Design brief:
Two copies of one chain form a homodimer. Chain A is mainly α. The first copy, chain A, is about 75% helix and about 0% strand. The structure holds noscapine (08N) (2 copies). One noscapine binds next to helix 4, helix 5, helix 7, helix 8 and helix 10 of chain B. The PDB classes it as transcription. The entry lists the keywords Transcription Factor, Protein Engineering, Specificity, Synthetic Biology, transcription. The assembly is dimeric.
Chain lengths: ~180, ~180
């Protein structure tokens, strides 16, 4: 099924990178390799769709825990940071794959913009405090990559030192905030 | 010699993480695991010695390129940033290996203290501008990991989009400077 292949592609891309074979992915999904291509016509297609599926999963937990009572930009961003830190901690495979898929040459401009416009409110809540350079078409991926690099580092230190996780998350957040916001 | 094991360790920890087995390291170097254990009594000893050797290779490349006439603290830091990014693009396995080793649990803090004190002038150069949080005993490793996560993203984008390399290095540097310095 389409769902069993996206899950195998998630784990494979997280462990082996974007160079994961489609022969490994369908095999790790219980279907033959031909079924993979009858759902995802090309390697690049599965790359782009899984990005859309992973970003949809990630933001749906971003906005799910977001307090709509909050109106201050920084406090609101602290909510989204804590949710993203928690999502990666609760879903280590999806976070690793969404990292390697956001980086890649293979993501088309249509998938990149649709990943932002899929949740328009959260986009404006996740972008309208940024350095304007990081919302440009040419540096938006890089801006997402600095954020995710800082978040991953925050995840690792926290899971490996739970007593201090509360401080890693706060320090990581302020560091991210000075790095990317205006 | 040991160099084959140290190099195999670099490639393997950069690929399969600190979780990489002693057997493949030894095997990808064409030496017996026993011999690996004849030179490194534990996997922990291997990981602490490797971190020392890898930090020495990186720090000396940093000081090999310094200009002793750069007396501005921020400009001097930008030179060191340029060196580190350059060192990471020329040796992506050594750089990828240094990030996982530095954030791992099994690295004794006598080891990483010895890593910073083998180049004391470099140590005080790159740490003189840092916030107190990131010079603390508890959050020093966290500061190095945030720096390295930002540099790694900078290297990844500069290598894959070289038409825009200069912007990534500059934006990466300024992002890092806001995140970690007073
Ligand atoms: C609604 O659509 C989106 C919003 C924001 C982002 C992406 C995105 O599309 C899927 C993306 O791919 O990456 C960022 C990045 C990010 C967030 C929140 C931020 C921030 C960020 O990095 C620029 O800067 C300060 O607040 C949320 C989590 N996400 C990893
Ligand atoms: C030799 O002595 C050292 C100096 C600086 C650092 C370490 C170190 O020991 C090996 C270290 O392990 O971590 C940092 C980190 C780092 C550098 C340069 C920086 C910086 C850094 O991290 C906070 O911030 C401001 O500029 C250089 C590279 N290195 C990865």
């Amino acid at each position: 099924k389409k769902q069993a292949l996206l899950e195998a592609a998630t784990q494979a891309i997280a462990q082996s990178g974007i160079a994961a074979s489609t022969a490994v992915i369908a095999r790790n999904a219980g279907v033959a390799e031909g079924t993979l291509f009858r759902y995802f016509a090309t390697k690049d297609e599965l790359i782009n769709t899984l990005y859309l599926h992973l970003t949809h999963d990630m933001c749906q937990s971003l906005i799910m825990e977001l307090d709509r009572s909050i109106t201050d930009a920084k406090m609101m961003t602290r909510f989204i940071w804590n949710s993203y830190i928690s999502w990666g901690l609760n879903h280590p495979a999806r976070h690793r794959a969404i990292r390697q898929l956001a980086v890649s040459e293979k993501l088309t401009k249509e998938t990149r913009q649709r990943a932002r416009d899929m949740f328009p409110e959260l986009r404006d809540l996740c972008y309208r405090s940024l350095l304007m350079v990081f919302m440009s078409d040419e540096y938006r991926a890089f801006g997402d990559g600095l954020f995710m690099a800082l978040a991953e580092t925050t995840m690792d230190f926290a899971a490996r030192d739970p007593a201090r996780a509360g401080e890693y998350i706060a320090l990581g957040f302020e560091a991210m905030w000075r790095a990317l916001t205006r």
